[PDB]
Design a protein around this ligand. Sequence first.
Ligand code: DCP
Ligand code: MG
Ligand code: MN
Length: 580
Amino acid sequence: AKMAFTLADRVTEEMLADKAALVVEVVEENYHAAPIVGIAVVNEHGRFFLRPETALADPQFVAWLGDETKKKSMFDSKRAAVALKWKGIELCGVSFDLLLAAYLLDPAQGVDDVAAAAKMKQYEAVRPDEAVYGKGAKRAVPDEPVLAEHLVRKAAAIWELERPFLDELRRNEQDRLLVELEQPLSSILAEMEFAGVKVDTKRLEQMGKELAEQLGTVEQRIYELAGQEFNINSPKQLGVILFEKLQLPVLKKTKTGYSTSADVLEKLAPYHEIVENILHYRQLGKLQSTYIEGLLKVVRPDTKKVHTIFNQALTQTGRLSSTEPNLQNIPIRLEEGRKIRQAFVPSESDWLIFAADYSQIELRVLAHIAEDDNLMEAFRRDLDIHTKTAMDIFQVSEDEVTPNMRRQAKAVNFGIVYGISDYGLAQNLNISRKEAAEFIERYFESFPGVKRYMENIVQEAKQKGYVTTLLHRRRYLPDITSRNFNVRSFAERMAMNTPIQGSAADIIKKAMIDLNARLKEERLQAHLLLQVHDELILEAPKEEMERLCRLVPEVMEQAVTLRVPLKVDYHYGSTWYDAK
DNA sequence: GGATCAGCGA
DNA sequence: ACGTCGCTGATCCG
Ligand SMILES: Nc1ccn([C@H]2C[C@H](O)[C@@H](COP(=O)(O)OP(=O)(O)OP(=O)(O)O)O2)c(=O)n1
Ligand SMILES: [Mg+2]
Ligand SMILES: [Mn+2]
């Protein structure tokens, strides 16, 4: 039923009040330099709809905006903030974000628009976004009066949902988690995205050059070794032209056939010199398309920068997400892939990249929550549990543990505390089930207080229906009561990982809050560029490095006081690769 | 277009 | 039965 609003053809005084619901509509999925299709304003004085072309020229409207004393209630404020940034317009004053509010109250709700968020509060006087602009090869902006009626309903929806959403947060002890943590971070992530990272494009290209070379040269050998013309990309083909054309053993099977995962071609290599050229050719493939081109595809022409979008209310545990491109999955494990980081450089001349980590954080975080005597005492002794477990998964001595090695021991360590079964472990470090099984018993012999944790957090979820993080981020687990054994089991493994994965994500979020607050009150040219789950990557002039090497680690270790010490590793250099 | 698959990261 | 949490490129298939 037509909600009455005045389609404004000019701005006015009564629509620039010190509190209003705002909507700077960015239909485009990727808001980087995306046009603004419309504006809407609800405030005690009424409901208005301003046309972008208009309002974004009006200095009185542009002022009310950039004015932090003029309050704005919104949904996905970063989406608008970044879009405006690219227009030279500053957006301050956002005191409430409906999107992040619904995320804290229940990340499983999967809110992708105001309607979905509103529905969560028995408010449905608003249409879902997909209904208004559609999707697929049809997607478009409805005509003036349709776009208008919707933007005003979304704004009106935001106007009314603030109270309901804030109260439940208040009762859930998440009001501060919203206002003092999630909302502050949204402005910082906007800067990081708008700032973007510089891309050594010339190099990156001269990389794709040779790749194609070492590709076909490893593609024909494949047709040779196989003796035909199958496409290395069809697992169905890799299955037949393998175990059924080329007769090899099946050590594992998929829900369609038999695994051709790398953890198989590996074990099934010596049975033919084709399984080796497939391992290498697939690596060069991935690294070729999913990166060289994949990155250059998002590199803007002028600034030569890429601008990731840090999705803040997407993951179910509190972690951030990155897309177009995913800068949280840049190669680093092997040497070939790692060099691509030499393509990531400082944004200004004579600057440096400063990357800071967090030493075995989830393990430290588990130590604090689980409170196992020996896991804490160990850290209080400053040991590297990854290297140690490596000393076993290889029986070697501390001095004989390699970077490559510490990785598997690391994956084993988390595999073990987060559910892993003797079979899962057995296939990982490629051993027997009886060995893996006993290695896990001794693990919990080393950390009994932790065993007790895997057992009570399962009961905790079973009783409350939700797990929680250090900073009060909660995760509902209704499948914990499932009568299906595997639904219940996945639920239980979530109750074991979410509190830990989530608390670690809360801490890197708070550290980020202290880091911007510090860099600002000390006024430095340095700023954050990326967040990689438990690592921050800043860029600054060479002259600030000496102050960074102390301020960046100190801020991160201070964020929260655990029963164990936090510890940061940090390095810097001319490129992302150099920063080590 | 979607459903698996592949491979990369934390 | 199944460690957790993500994103992107490639090809099978109506
Ligand atoms: N196989 C993995 C790898 C990582 N993580 C989680 C736990 C780690 O603590 C966190 C950060 O990833 P890192 O690679 O930084 O691992 P740590 O931080 O634990 O090790 P490092 O001492 O190298 O920082 O991500 C996990 O659950 N399972
Ligand atoms: Mg890391
Ligand atoms: Mn780390």
